[PDB]
């Protein structure tokens, strides 16, 4: 089987993307933010406490014939940017893009963090790293792309991420009509639960490569691009008027600026993130001050390869027996 939907950016910056998932008998379809980063499908749901929703859709276990309480199960998460949501579970059928598994956990949201509520268009999330790190207890469960995997023709997804534009989720093939050149592919490291890699160095616009290895996790989840921040010093010196700012929690420039490229190595191919993917506008309505895409890891304590650099590059999630990432241009 071969699964094959849109993922469209939530706004104009692209802050997220989202993904429509049918969820339940007859489908409840909801829009959800896929995650490479974590590894709960969670919903925005009839139990959700009530002043916690703001205009998300929500899935009603009670009005799909296919759903079943899974009893004495509960679930509880905090992501890095100190976002949190708790819940119970259900078991249901879930289909992507026509790819359906049946008895997916479908964790149900009792609450949710003001960051959540506040995104009106983000249903909830569906992870898509390795089972170990899901939430659900006492019995842990595993994610879409692991109940899936033994039905797929080939036992891969791909994120094929626009930049201001849709893009592509694809399971179980990889569409060799959506990416230039070959792919090149490297070791994943499944230690912490994470697409976990290691460029092999960057470039800052028309500079010199340095080879550097700089480990990090694959994560569509996370809008920026989070790296060492020697990295990031040496992009931003490139930029008249950059400074970090303790205010507003990171580098910014001048609204006025032409951002260079940046480059990441892949092996021995290199990935060009474009300047303008690097914008992300003004820090407040009407601000000459602009926010910039390439930030610090200091104190995240990993660096994140997020919606910044993957959107650069057809990205595959090889999850056979030993897991590998590839990268193509396109």
Do not use: M
Not at 84 to 111: R, W
Request: glycine share 12%.
């Amino acid at each position: 089987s071969t699964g094959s939907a849109t993922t469209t950016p939530i706004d104009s910056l692209d802050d997220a993307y989202i993904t429509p998932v049918q969820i339940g008998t007859p489908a409840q379809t909801l829009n959800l933010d896929f995650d490479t980063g974590s590894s709960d499908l969670w919903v925005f749901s009839s139990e959700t406490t009530a002043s916690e929703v703001d205009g998300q859709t929500i899935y009603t276990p009670s009005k799909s014939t296919t759903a079943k309480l899974l009893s004495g199960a509960t679930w509880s998460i905090s992501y890095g940017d100190g976002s949190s949501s708790s819940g119970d579970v259900y078991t249901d059928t879930v289909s992507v893009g026509g790819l359906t598994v049946t008895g997916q956990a479908v964790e149900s949201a009792k609450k949710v963090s003001s960051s959540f509520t506040e995104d009106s268009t983000i249903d909830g999330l569906l992870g898509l790293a390795f089972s170990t790190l899901n939430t659900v207890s006492p019995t842990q469960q595993k994610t879409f792309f692991d109940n899936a995997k033994a039905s797929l023709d080939s036992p891969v997804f791909t994120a094929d991420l626009g930049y201001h534009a849709p893009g592509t989720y694809n399971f179980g093939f990889i569409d060799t009509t959506a990416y230039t050149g070959s792919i090149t592919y490297t070791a994943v490291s499944t230690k912490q639960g994470f697409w976990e890699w290691t460029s092999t160095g960057y470039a800052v616009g028309s500079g010199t490569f340095k080879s550097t290895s700089i480990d990090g996790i694959a994560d569509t989840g996370t809008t920026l691009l989070y790296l060492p921040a020697t990295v990031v010093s040496a992009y931003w010196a490139q930029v008249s008027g950059a400074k970090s700012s303790s205010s507003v929690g990171g580098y910014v420039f001048p609204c006025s600026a032409t951002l260079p490229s940046f480059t990441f190595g892949v092996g021995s191919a290199r990935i060009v993130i474009p300047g303008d993917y690097i914008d992300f506008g003004p820090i407040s309505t009407g601000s000459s001050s602009c926010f910039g895409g390439i930030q610090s890891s200091a104190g995240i304590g990993i660096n994140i390869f997020g919606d910044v650099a993957l959107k650069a590059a057809f990205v595959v999630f090889n999850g056979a027996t030993t897991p590998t990432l590839g990268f193509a241009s396109k």
